[PDB]
Design a protein around this ligand. Structure first.
Ligand SMILES: Nc1ncnc2c1ncn2[C@@H]1O[C@H](COP(=O)(O)OP(=O)(O)OP(=O)(O)O)[C@@H](O)[C@H]1O
Ligand SMILES: [Mg+2]
Lengths: 152, 149, 194, 278, 159
């Protein structure tokens, strides 16, 4: 549960099945793991749905830390095909739960959005105002504080 | 004028008496003319009906066929008649109209053209609108009507 | 002005005051597709029903309509070929025929270049008629005419278009109307002050 | 400073909770009558030029009358949905009250507020309280009812002719009331609501069971064609009672034997007649 | 029947016109079957554009419509089944498998053309949002149709 927090906890489902798949087989006590997964059809869909939850966790962190990403890199990082990665992402965007857009003639997809001249200029003034005038106000007063301690 | 108040009104009595005394009291005032208008003639009080106060009592009967013809000409002025149309027969179809319902014919005939997205009219449209405005009780069972021959 | 008050077609009997009816319908359907392209042409003449009665009588006129609206361009020229030759038998005819066809030929081009921005004129060689060099010469005459806002090409053989944006359209109108009123108050300021 | 005109007076503006909780297509089967109200109220606000093109003076007031529970108040709610006017609700009882002359001043408060505002709609609910024609009253406070009529007749057809205001009235049996109301120019539209008839029982059956998990192969066709006529609010209660009686045996579904228990519950009324006077 | 027809040709009121056709068939109930057999065709088609295709099956399972089974009820069942499934070519296949019943126009083929030429861009607007830019043979593949009509159908949507 710590590994499924955020910031990828850097993970991969192939590694996840080969270190915790022993937890799904016999152990010391272990019994809710055999109770939830490992069944005939009830656990088996829950094997699939855990796969669904971890790939959904990997999409949201990609939207955090990528301007763009090629289609072949997303396929090899989600442990699944190119066509499945198309349809799984196309499901999430018609559900509009992850806000992305693709270009499948070249495979280069993007996560960022087209910003506006009202918006880019608003970001230009924001870094200008809030953290070049105020921090310059801030440095001056600690600079006066050093004259207190150092002389005499 | 009713009696004193148990079921008595006794306050607009005071207001009526001042109307009755500020126009025919102690001073016959001049250059002041009142125009009073109501139906229900037999129930207003017979002290402001005396001919010292009101001198002209003017009835208003329902109009005649020529008069129903003329009011129809007034309200169909801004309307847009087709041709070949006889306004006289339309007023012949109203035995005892008011004249406030001659407007109602002119509105409903224009209303029939409105639902067609049209501006035309016929004489038949008025022949439908007269029977629409004219409305009866349609007294049923005939037993009441023929008990009373 | 013709197509606006032709549009009330509720006048039927071939009288002196209504000189004919069926040819009046053909008059108001020829002139109608120049007044408006799609600010709801289809309601007033296609969703119109009293017009739709008598163009159900005339098959060639109705085919001339629906070829243009349902974007059948190859049969549109064959329909327009009959119209121009049938127009020849008319006595109010002199303003029509050299101006009518060329306005409609450039009318069909403008909506066809719409919805594309990389067209190839080889696709005009069968979806449209024939004559690769014919489309080439007629677009060249119409682009040089100041109409038909696109850019024809040689050996790539790609009819690229260029249409303005909002701002590139609005900036042009304000600089035309700007210099008009500027010139207008040039002359007015010189009439006053001697 | 000068305040805006009648900025308070009676403060009656139904805007945005509260407003209708209904829509126009929710009513099933009043095909003539939805159109007829729409001519007098909805249409001249938008397509005012159509009346000017013919020169009509579009109608001003409307009276609705029928047996109770036949969609009168419901239709008035639907007009208040899709209108873009200042809407004012009145019930025909709160402007007859304690003090002398107090009632007709409230009538003055309404019609000034509508005339001051935009094109506006005034819906006065059941008016047969103040509508009965009086010949003479040998009592106090019955002429107070009778003069509320006269103030209503004045500010409807006086000199001033307050344009763009609209009046919608609805009663029970309307043979009772004053013929001075019923003259056109004042109450132009006379609309009767029947109960349903057949082919409108079908439409109210459709519109209620549409938003309902009926999902059977046993149809209400047996109960469209029944005699002993059944008002439109009762069709609601049939589906409501079966809705109770579906969940009562713990079903999501109406199993069409509950449907007959619901039918016989709502219809069982005349039971004795003493086998006498037939 | 004709009261259903002109109410159908409004393309506005597909529920009252159903009641007019239904009364027309109850009047036609086994007293003139050649005029009665066409009556289910109108009222089922009134139900198709009413977008309740399951009740088409519910009517023909009804004991009055069991009198008049045959080809024409099999036509409107599979058409309703394809429109329920939103499979576009299956509608065209059901149009193609049963020609002479319902590609003639008394006058149901008009509205079936309207419902088909609705249901194209009903499905087409669902499958644009994944991308900013695609080539059209993929969008023919996701719709399972040729590309030539797709070119004409898309271009009409821009126009
Ligand atoms: N055609 C209809 N469609 C849907 N519901 C209806 C219809 N007719 C009546 N109803 C139901 O009947 C109920 C009563 O409606 P409404 O109050 O308008 O009837 P009413 O005639 O105004 O009754 P009253 O005159 O006693 O006020 C409404 O809540 C509504 O649910
Ligand atoms: Mg009510």
């Amino acid at each position: 549960l710590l590994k499924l927090f955020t910031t990828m906890e850097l993970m991969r489902w192939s590694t996840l099945v080969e270190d915790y798949g022993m937890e799904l087989r016999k152990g010391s006590l272990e019994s809710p793991a055999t109770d939830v997964f490992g069944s005939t059809e009830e656990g088996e869909k829950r094997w699939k749905d855990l796969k669904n939850r971890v790939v959904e966790h990997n999409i949201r962190i990609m939207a955090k830390y990528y301007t763009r990403i090629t289609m072949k890199r997303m396929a090899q990082l989600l442990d699944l095909s190119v066509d499945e990665s198309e349809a799984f992402l196309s499901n999430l965007v018609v559900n509009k739960t992850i806000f992305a857009k693709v270009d499948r003639l070249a495979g280069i997809i993007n996560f960022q959005r087209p910003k506006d001249p009202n918006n880019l200029l608003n970001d230009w003034s924001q870094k200008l105002n809030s953290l070049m005038s105020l921090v310059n106000k801030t440095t001056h007063l600690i600079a006066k504080e050093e004259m207190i301690h150092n002389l005499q | 004028r009713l009696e004193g108040g148990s079921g008595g009104d006794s306050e607009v009595q005071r207001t009526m008496l001042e109307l009755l005394n500020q126009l025919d009291g102690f001073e016959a005032t001049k250059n002041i003319k009142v125009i009073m208008a109501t139906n229900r003639i037999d129930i207003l009080d017979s002290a402001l009906l005396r001919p010292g106060r009101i001198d002209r009592k003017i009835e208003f009967p329902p109009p005649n066929e020529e008069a129903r013809l003329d009011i129809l000409k007034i309200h169909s002025r801004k309307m847009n008649l087709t041709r070949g149309i006889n306004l006289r027969k339309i007023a012949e179809l109203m035995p005892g109209a008011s004249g406030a319902e001659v407007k109602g014919v002119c509105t409903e005939a224009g209303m029939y053209a409105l639902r067609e997205r049209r501006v035309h009219v016929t004489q038949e449209d008025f022949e439908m609108a007269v029977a629409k405005v004219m409305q009866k009780d349609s007294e049923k069972n005939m037993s009441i009507k023929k008990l009373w021959k | 002005q013709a197509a606006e008050l032709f549009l009330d077609t509720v006048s039927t009997f071939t009288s002196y005051e209504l000189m004919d009816y069926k040819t009046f319908v053909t008059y108001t359907v020829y002139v109608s597709m120049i007044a408006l392209e799609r600010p709801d042409l289809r309601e007033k003449v296609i969703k119109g029903a009293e017009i739709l009665e008598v163009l159900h009588s005339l098959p060639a006129v109705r085919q001339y309509l629906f070829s243009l609206y349902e974007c059948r361009y190859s049969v549109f020229f064959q329909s327009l070929a009959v119209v121009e030759q049938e127009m020849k038998k008319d006595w109010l005819f002199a303003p029509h025929y050299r101006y009518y066809v060329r306005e409609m030929r450039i009318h069909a081009y403008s909506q066809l270049l719409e919805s594309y921005r990389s067209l190839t004129l080889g696709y005009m060689a069968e979806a449209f008629g024939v004559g690769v060099e014919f489309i080439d010469q007629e677009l060249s005459r119409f682009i040089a005419a100041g109409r038909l806002h696109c850019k024809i090409d040689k050996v790539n053989e790609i009819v690229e278009t260029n249409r303005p944006d909002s701002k590139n359209w609005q900036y042009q109108e304000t600089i035309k109307k700007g210099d008009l009123l500027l010139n207008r108050v040039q002359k007015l300021s010189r009439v006053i002050n001697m | 400073d000068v305040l805006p005109p009648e900025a308070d007076s009676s403060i009656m503006m139904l805007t945005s909770d509260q407003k209708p909780d209904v829509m126009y297509a929710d009513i099933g089967g009043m095909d003539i009558q939805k159109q007829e109200v729409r001519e007098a109220v909805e249409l001249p606000l938008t397509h005012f030029e159509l009346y000017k093109q013919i020169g009509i003076d579009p109608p001003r007031g409307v009276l609705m009358y029928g047996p109770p529970g036949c969609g009168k108040t419901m239709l008035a709610k639907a007009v208040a949905h899709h209108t873009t006017a200042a809407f004012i609700r009145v019930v025909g009882s709160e402007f007859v009250q304690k003090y002398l002359g107090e009632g007709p001043r409230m009538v003055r408060d309404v019609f000034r507020l509508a005339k001051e505002n935009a094109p506006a709609i005034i819906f006065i609910d059941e008016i047969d309280a103040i509508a009965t024609k009086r010949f003479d009253a040998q009592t106090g406070a019955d002429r107070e009812v009778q003069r509320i009529l006269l103030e209503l007749l004045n500010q409807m057809d006086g000199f001033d002719q307050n344009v763009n205001v609209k009046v919608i009235m609805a009663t029970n049996r309307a043979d009772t009331l004053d013929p001075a109301l019923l003259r056109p120019g004042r109450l132009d539209r006379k609309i009767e609501f029947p109960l349903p008839d057949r082919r409108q029982k079908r439409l109210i059956f459709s519109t209620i069971t549409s938003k309902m998990n009926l999902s059977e192969e046993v149809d209400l066709e047996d109960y469209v064609a029944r005699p002993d006529k059944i008002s439109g609010a009762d069709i609601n209660s049939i589906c409501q009672e079966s809705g109770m009686l579906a969940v009562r045996e713990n079903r999501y579904i109406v199993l069409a034997k509950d449907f007959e228990k619901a039918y016989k519950t709502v219809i069982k009324k005349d039971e004795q007649e003493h086998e006498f006077y037939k | 029947m004709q009261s259903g027809i002109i109410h159908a040709a409004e393309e506005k009121d597909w529920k009252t016109a159903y009641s007019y056709f239904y009364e027309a068939f109850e009047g036609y109930d086994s007293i003139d079957s050649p005029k009665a057999i066409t009556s289910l065709k109108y009222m089922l088609l009134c139900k198709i554009m009413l977008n309740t295709p399951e009740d088409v099956q519910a009517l023909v399972s009804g004991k009055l419509a069991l009198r008049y089974a045959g080809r024409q009820t099999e036509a409107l069942k599979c058409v309703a089944q394809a429109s329920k499934n939103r499979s576009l070519a299956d509608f065209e296949k059901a149009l193609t498998d049963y020609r002479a019943e319902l590609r003639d126009d008394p006058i149901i083929s008009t509205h079936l053309a309207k419902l088909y030429d609705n249901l194209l861009e009903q499905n087409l607007i669902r499958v644009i949002e994944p991308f900013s830019r695609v080539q059209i043979e993929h969008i023919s593949s996701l719709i399972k149709l040729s590309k030539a009509d797709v070119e004409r159908k898309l271009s009409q949507m821009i126009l």
